[PDB]
């Protein structure tokens, strides 16, 4: 179990950690989150009480260092930093615990939700999508745009997801125009799995990371990427059996975790109706299909 202390909480802010979140009042004595499960990535995120725009936050993994939050009054936001003085850090952590000013990561022991949402997400891959290599954690916010969005401005702040485009030379072999457009198996298995992602776990990991950015920050380009990566699989006639079954599990927990009131912008009607009812894989997503019907029958 690990800890992320906070120097202070100078402005009123809703703090989130993974799928949990806490209201913290202006200069309330709040000084961190403890009992954070080692073994997964995590994301701590913020929404100021004054600006319900720009949700922002930090992806991190405690194994990779000691991290803390500090409010910067010049830039006006909670910043994640690394403490290199390991002694000085257990010092701050133990004093804040003794003084009991820290919330406990509130995991029900029966609950595998966060594991299920993050099964395939690796910090190393996160830091290639969010290139900022002087930090071991990654910043994401509501407004960051993707590399593909930019092509159609500032690259230092871009989400470098893998570009997927169903009407591109990459996706379509010359002479297999009709075949490859109607059956993306080539694009999926050779171009994307064997070519770029190398295996399905990296693929699944970007897919899950894309979803979580969409959910936690309402990052619209992340949502585009999540849907594209689902559509690519559902529009392929030939998909390894192990991927289909895992995909059904991944999507199930993503749909299960979505806030009910957000289904209108986070869920692309066309993609889900094609994947669940028209695609080659209409029948391979029984759990994802059962939970979509019983929870969002309107969208379908």
């Amino acid at each position: 179990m690990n800890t992320v202390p906070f120097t202070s909480a100078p402005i009123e802010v809703t703090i989130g950690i993974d799928q949990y979140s806490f209201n913290v009042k202006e200069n309330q004595p709040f000084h961190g989150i403890k009992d954070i499960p080692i073994g997964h990535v995590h994301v701590i995120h913020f929404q100021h009480a004054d600006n319900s725009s720009m949700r922002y936050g930090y992806w991190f993994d405690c194994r990779m260092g000691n991290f803390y939050i500090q409010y910067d009054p010049k830039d006006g936001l909670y910043k994640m930093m690394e403490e290199r003085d390991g002694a000085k850090f257990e010092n701050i952590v133990h004093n804040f615990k003794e003084r009991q000013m820290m919330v406990s990561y509130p995991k029900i022991d029966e609950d595998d939700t966060w594991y299920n949402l993050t099964e395939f997400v690796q910090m190393d891959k996160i830091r290639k999508i969010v290139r900022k290599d002087e930090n071991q954690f990654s910043y994401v916010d509501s407004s960051m745009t993707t590399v593909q969005e930019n092509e159609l401005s500032d690259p230092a702040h871009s989400l470098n997801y893998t570009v997927i485009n169903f009407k591109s030379r990459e996706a379509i072999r010359p002479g297999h125009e009709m075949e490859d457009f109607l059956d993306k198996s080539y694009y999926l298995n050779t171009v994307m799995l064997q070519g770029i992602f190398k295996n399905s776990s990296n693929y699944f990991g970007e897919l899950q990371f894309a979803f979580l950015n969409a959910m936690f920050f309402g990052n619209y380009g992340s949502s585009l990427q999540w849907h594209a990566m689902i559509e690519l699989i559902c529009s392929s006639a030939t998909v390894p059996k192990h991927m289909l079954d895992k995909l059904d599990e991944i999507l199930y927990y993503q749909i299960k975790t979505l806030p009910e009131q957000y289904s209108d912008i986070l869920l692309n009607e066309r993609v889900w109706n094609i994947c669940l009812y028209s695609s080659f894989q209409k029948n391979s997503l029984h759990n994802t299909e059962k939970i979509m019907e019983n929870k969002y029958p309107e969208l379908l």
Partner: protein
Amino acid sequence: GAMNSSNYAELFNNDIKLFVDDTNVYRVTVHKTFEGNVATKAINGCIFTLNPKTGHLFLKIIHTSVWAGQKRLSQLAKWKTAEEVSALVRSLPKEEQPKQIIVTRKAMLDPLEVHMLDFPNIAIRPTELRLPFSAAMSIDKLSDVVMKATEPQMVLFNIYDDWLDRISSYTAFSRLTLLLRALKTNEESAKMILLSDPTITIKSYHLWPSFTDEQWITIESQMRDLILTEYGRKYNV
């Protein structure tokens, strides 16, 4: 963007563009089998690719052999259209290649777009216009060359005959679409109107009779009357 009546004169500027109509690419008769079931028999078809400014028609004949052993023929027809249009563009010298291709049916967009990925500066556009190019097989010389073909074949025509020696593209295209509109709404009357006078002939190298200017006026009026009549009949107005 989509062509409509607002951006209509754009068809006659100096940017090369082609209309593509695929309505006659896959043509069948529907008959009953010995056991009483229904079956189709394909007949020869054609892609109707037309430059509305110059009148050049690229009539690509689709021979029934292309369907042999194939499934989802109506879907395949769209991809075969796109394949053949792309090949036509590739066959043309650079300076003759269109800057835009306008498909008369939206279902052609994705097939053409995918086939034209090597031509990203060629815009593929839909249209809101209800163009009558399906009636192209009501032009006897076009139906005839299509129906006789024994193999894939491209036949070139000027759909305007020699009109442009005397009238503008705009006017030429409006005459063509009026004629084809009439032939579509009531072929028999339309054809009657075009030929009632045995003394006005079709030159061997033309598709339509060699009407004088005054005779084109009377003709154009007779087609307009045909089309309006058929509307009242259709709707009881």
